Design a protein around this motif. Structure first.
Motif, short mmCIF file in Angstrom:
data_model
loop_
_atom_site.label_atom_id
_atom_site.label_comp_id
_atom_site.label_asym_id
_atom_site.label_seq_id
_atom_site.Cartn_x
_atom_site.Cartn_y
_atom_site.Cartn_z
N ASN A 44 0.84 -1.19 0.00
CA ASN A 44 0.00 0.00 0.00
C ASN A 44 0.88 1.25 0.00
N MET A 45 1.88 1.30 0.89
CA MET A 45 2.66 2.53 0.92
C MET A 45 3.57 2.69 -0.29
N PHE A 46 3.82 1.64 -1.08
CA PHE A 46 4.48 1.90 -2.36
C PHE A 46 3.62 2.73 -3.29
N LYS A 47 2.32 2.43 -3.38
CA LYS A 47 1.46 3.29 -4.18
C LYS A 47 1.32 4.65 -3.53
N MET A 48 1.42 4.70 -2.20
CA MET A 48 1.35 6.00 -1.55
C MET A 48 2.56 6.84 -1.92
N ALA A 49 3.71 6.20 -2.15
CA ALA A 49 4.96 6.88 -2.46
C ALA A 49 5.17 7.10 -3.95
N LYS A 50 4.11 7.07 -4.75
CA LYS A 50 4.17 7.42 -6.17
C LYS A 50 5.16 6.55 -6.95
N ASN A 51 5.23 5.27 -6.60
CA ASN A 51 6.29 4.44 -7.16
C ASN A 51 5.85 3.80 -8.47
N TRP A 52 4.70 3.14 -8.44
CA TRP A 52 3.97 2.65 -9.60
C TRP A 52 4.62 1.47 -10.32
N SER A 53 5.85 1.12 -9.95
CA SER A 53 6.62 0.08 -10.63
C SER A 53 7.08 -1.02 -9.69
N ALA A 54 7.58 -0.68 -8.50
CA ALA A 54 7.72 -1.65 -7.42
C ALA A 54 6.44 -1.84 -6.63
N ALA A 55 5.47 -0.93 -6.76
CA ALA A 55 4.25 -1.02 -5.98
C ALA A 55 3.40 -2.21 -6.40
N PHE A 86 2.33 -5.69 -4.47
CA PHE A 86 1.05 -6.38 -4.39
C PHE A 86 1.15 -7.81 -4.90
N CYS A 87 1.92 -8.01 -5.97
CA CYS A 87 2.14 -9.35 -6.49
C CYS A 87 2.71 -10.26 -5.42
N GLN A 88 3.76 -9.80 -4.74
CA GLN A 88 4.41 -10.63 -3.74
C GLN A 88 3.56 -10.79 -2.48
N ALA A 89 2.81 -9.75 -2.11
CA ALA A 89 1.93 -9.83 -0.95
C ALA A 89 0.85 -10.88 -1.17
N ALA A 90 0.29 -10.93 -2.37
CA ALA A 90 -0.65 -11.99 -2.71
C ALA A 90 0.04 -13.33 -2.90
N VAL A 105 -6.03 -8.47 -8.54
CA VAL A 105 -6.84 -7.46 -9.21
C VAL A 105 -6.27 -6.08 -8.94
N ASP A 106 -5.86 -5.84 -7.70
CA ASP A 106 -5.25 -4.56 -7.35
C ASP A 106 -3.91 -4.39 -8.05
N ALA A 107 -3.19 -5.49 -8.25
CA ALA A 107 -1.94 -5.44 -8.98
C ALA A 107 -2.18 -5.23 -10.47
N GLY A 108 -3.33 -5.68 -10.96
CA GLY A 108 -3.76 -5.29 -12.28
C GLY A 108 -4.15 -3.84 -12.36
N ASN A 109 -4.67 -3.29 -11.26
CA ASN A 109 -4.91 -1.86 -11.15
C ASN A 109 -3.64 -1.08 -10.81
N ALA A 110 -2.53 -1.78 -10.60
CA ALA A 110 -1.26 -1.16 -10.25
C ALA A 110 -0.50 -0.69 -11.49
N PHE A 111 -0.09 -1.63 -12.35
CA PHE A 111 0.75 -1.28 -13.49
C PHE A 111 -0.07 -0.80 -14.68
N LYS A 112 -1.40 -0.83 -14.58
CA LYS A 112 -2.30 -0.35 -15.63
C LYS A 112 -2.22 1.16 -15.79
N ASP A 170 2.84 2.52 -17.39
CA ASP A 170 3.08 1.90 -18.70
C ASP A 170 3.44 0.40 -18.76
N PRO A 171 4.09 -0.21 -17.75
CA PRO A 171 4.48 -1.63 -17.86
C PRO A 171 3.29 -2.56 -18.02
N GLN A 172 3.55 -3.70 -18.65
CA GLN A 172 2.55 -4.70 -18.98
C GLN A 172 2.35 -5.74 -17.89
N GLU A 173 3.03 -5.63 -16.75
CA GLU A 173 2.89 -6.62 -15.69
C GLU A 173 1.43 -6.79 -15.26
N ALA A 174 0.65 -5.71 -15.29
CA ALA A 174 -0.74 -5.78 -14.85
C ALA A 174 -1.57 -6.79 -15.63
#
Lengths: 98, 58, 154, 286, 66, 154
Positions: free
Chosen positions: D43-54, D58-62, D79-86, D89-93
């Motif tokens: 959660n705090m990775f998305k809070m820290a505007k990271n968008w790429s490790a964030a 979520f992937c690893q947390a799940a 699903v949240d990790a799909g909402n992460a990299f979406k 630009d990266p395709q991981e989502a």
């Protein structure tokens, strides 16, 4: 719009008893603990009736959607607090295994 | 004709007030889905957790 | 004879569109044979096969007059079956046709001797199947016409 | 203060132990504590505007919840990790959105599966242009929305299929779509004033379809031709496809603007109109 | 009154055009709320099937105390 | 049996103040029931919906077509029973959308009562443009003119 606004009334029917079980099952949980221009003129007067029916229901649909949005204002807060309650209640209930 | 023109152009603007509504319509139609979709799993899995719970403490 | 489902297609070139022959591929049927297109219980139309090296095996090419007569387009399911006429009572001996200019923006008043037209008509539409009321196009002295079979006699 | 310490501190604890650290029990409360550290981290990775490790967090947390008891909140974290990299630009989502599909599809949750199966095609077409797979997922997801009979979600998928079957140029399948959905609509007052829009959308889909199916699908769909948006479909189409049968493009191009005078044209229609106008032009030379 | 005949034509075509502008906004409006009615259909799913999970689960957690 | 399912199911929805399906499934009862067989249920249903429709500030505009459905069902009735609903109902007839409910009716009552057809049919000659007609409305059109046939057709 009307049948969907009373569909939102059945949303209220769901949300109230969900939140009623979920202001409750947390407590049950800790208990568990232990000469034709005149024809055109007639067309104009037809339209003068048209714009009256238009405007009347225009103001009314303004009120209508405002009512449904305050109904949504109810839903959001109560459903979201209840979203917090379901996850804390599920994880609290599972952490009292054994 | 021009009296009706003014009246009707007021009503063009009543429709523009409906355009002022429609963004407030559509975004709220979005976010209520944005909650309901997320509510569905938390609603779904709790009976399964209940089954996991109540097999033990009879 | 089994009748095969085919797809009404488009005439390859402009030469065969003047022949009123169901243009086909040399890989399915052969030019000279006759077929009966079937689109519905109340639509049985008879055409003349005319192979051509640019038809895809499993599709039958039709000209606009045939399609504007049979109401056919490029790509519907139809059943085509070989049909063998009865020469004794189906050979044409005197046939009336309602003739008219095909292109309305090419209308002239020059005289065209029919005595030459019939001779060129049999020299081009020989061994073909023609039904009553059938419409087609004839090329007389580099001029397009719109024929319309009015009556046939055996 | 960032979670890069939280990840390694829970990564010390994520060991699959064979010692007194387990004893008789495992690390069940311990691994729930660990996955809570991963939750807070992601959660705090998305809070820290990271968008790429964030989204990776979520992937690893799940991922450390998948093998425990329940892929379910781990699936929602996918699903949240799909909402992460979406948003990024990266395709991981998209991969995480697959993971969600083979959890929710695998489990009986076709509804939420169809909820983001459409968003996958929204990315394969809008963002990550792979439009035949986007269309295959609109079509597949519409099959699911018709599985639970949620119709207009499937029809919203079918416009992205069918409307993009115009520039993919399978007109034969474009007209194979608006028929069964719009002839089902005259009984509905919900869409009837819209249904004739769809049988403009059925009708003007030509690959130069000059049959009278265009003169008959307008009739099976029973349609008062003096309807005043069918004046913008039917007799519009008469002038549009009689002039083609006149072989005369000029009054065609004047009357298409006459249509523009009474109902302005949009992207999908206008592109198909210049398309069919090419067909009319290339037919009027010969 | 060719001034007023030409205006009887032209100004009143503008009157139909203005109603056509609001007609565009209204076919937009009505077909938009139409399209929203499908999200209301997914509510109709997620309004009582949500209850069909939740109330049914609390029928066994409240009775898990038993 | 399905209409009985709507009926008992709407009895459950009534007893839970889920007024949505309570009105809805009743409308599904009456819209087919009136034309096929049940007549007093038609106005009784469309009045039960119509009163509480007039009640709520959300519902009283849906009542217009509800009392249209109550009115235009004629039950082998030649009369102005629809006009009994007119001088009953809170129309506020300077609301002209109910003139497509009752001035429609104020024509066709005396068209059917003076056994006249070129005014009755003229009502839908003009009303088909200003209102698109679905299957049930035109079947009821045909219903009241079957009463016109029983008034005229020897």
């Amino acid at each position: 719009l009307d049948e969907q606004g009373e569909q939102l009334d059945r949303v209220e029917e769901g949300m109230n008893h969900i939140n009623q079980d979920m202001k409750e099952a947390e407590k049950n949980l800790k208990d568990l603990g232990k000469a034709r221009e005149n024809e055109m003129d007639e067309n104009l007067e037809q339209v003068s009736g048209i714009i009256g029916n238009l405007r009347h229901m225009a103001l009314d649909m303004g009120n209508e959607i405002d009512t449904q949005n305050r109904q949504i204002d109810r839903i959001m807060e109560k459903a979201d607090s209840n979203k917090t309650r379901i996850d804390e209640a599920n994880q609290r209930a599972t952490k009292m295994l054994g | 004709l021009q009296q009706t023109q003014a009246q009707v152009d007021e009503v063009v603007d009543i429709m523009r007030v409906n355009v002022d509504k429609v963004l407030e319509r559509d975004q709220k139609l979005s976010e209520l889905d944005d909650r309901a979709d997320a509510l569905q799993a938390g609603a779904s899995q709790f009976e399964t957790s209940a089954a996991k719970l109540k097999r033990k403490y009879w | 004879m089994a009748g095969r489902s085919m797809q009404a297609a488009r005439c390859p070139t402009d030469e065969l569109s003047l022949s009123n022959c169901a243009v086909v591929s040399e890989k399915d049927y052969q030019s000279g044979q006759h077929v009966i297109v079937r689109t519905s219980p109340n639509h049985k139309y008879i055409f003349t096969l005319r192979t051509h090296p640019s038809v895809v095996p499993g599709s039958v090419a039709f000209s606009l007059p045939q399609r504007k007569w049979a109401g056919l387009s490029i790509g519907q399911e139809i059943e085509v079956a070989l049909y063998s006429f009865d020469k004794a009572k189906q050979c044409i001996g005197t046939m009336t046709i309602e003739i008219d200019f095909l292109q309305k923006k090419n209308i002239d008043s020059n005289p065209y001797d029919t005595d030459k037209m019939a001779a060129e008509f049999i020299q081009q539409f020989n061994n073909q199947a023609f039904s009553v009321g059938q419409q087609l196009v004839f090329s007389f002295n580099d001029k397009l016409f719109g024929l319309l079979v009015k009556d046939i006699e055996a | 203060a960032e979670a890069m310490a939280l990840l390694a501190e829970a990564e010390r604890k994520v060991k699959n132990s064979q010692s007194f650290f387990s004893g008789l029990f495992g690390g069940s409360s311990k691994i729930e504590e660990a996955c809570e550290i991963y939750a807070r981290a992601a959660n705090m990775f998305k809070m820290a505007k990271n968008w790429s490790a964030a989204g990776n967090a979520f992937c690893q947390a799940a991922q450390l919840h998948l093998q425990l008891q329940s892929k379910h909140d781990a699936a929602t974290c996918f699903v949240d990790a799909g909402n992460a990299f979406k948003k990024a630009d990266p395709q991981e989502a998209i991969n995480c959105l697959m993971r969600a599909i083979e959890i929710y599809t695998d489990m009986g949750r076709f509804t939420i599966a169809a909820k983001h199966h459409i968003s996958i095609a929204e990315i394969y077409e809008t963002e990550l242009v792979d439009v035949e797979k986007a269309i295959a997922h609109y079509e597949q997801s519409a099959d699911y929305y018709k599985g639970e009979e949620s119709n207009s979600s499937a029809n919203k998928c079918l416009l992205k299929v069918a409307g993009y079957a115009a520039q993919l140029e399978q007109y034969q399948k474009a007209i194979d779509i608006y028929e069964q959905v719009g002839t089902s609509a005259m009984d509905s007052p919900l869409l009837k004033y819209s249904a004739k829009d769809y049988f403009f959308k059925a009708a003007l889909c030509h690959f130069c379809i000059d049959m009278l199916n265009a003169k008959l699908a307008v009739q099976k769909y029973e349609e008062l031709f003096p309807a005043f948006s069918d004046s913008r479909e039917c007799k519009l189409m008469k002038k549009l496809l009689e002039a083609h049968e006149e072989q005369n493009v000029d009054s065609y191009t004047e009357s298409v603007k006459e249509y523009d005078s009474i109902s302005r044209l949009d992207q999908w229609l206008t592109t198909m109109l210049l398309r069919i106008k090419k067909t009319i032009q290339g037919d009027e030379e010969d | 009154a060719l001034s007023e005949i030409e205006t009887r034509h032209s100004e009143i075509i503008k009157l139909e055009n203005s109603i056509r502008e609001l007609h565009d906004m209204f076919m937009d409006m009505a077909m938009l709320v139409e399209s929203q009615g499908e999200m209301i259909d997914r509510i109709e799913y997620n309004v009582e099937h949500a209850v069909d999970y939740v109330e049914r689960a609390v029928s066994d957690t409240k009775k898990a105390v038993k």
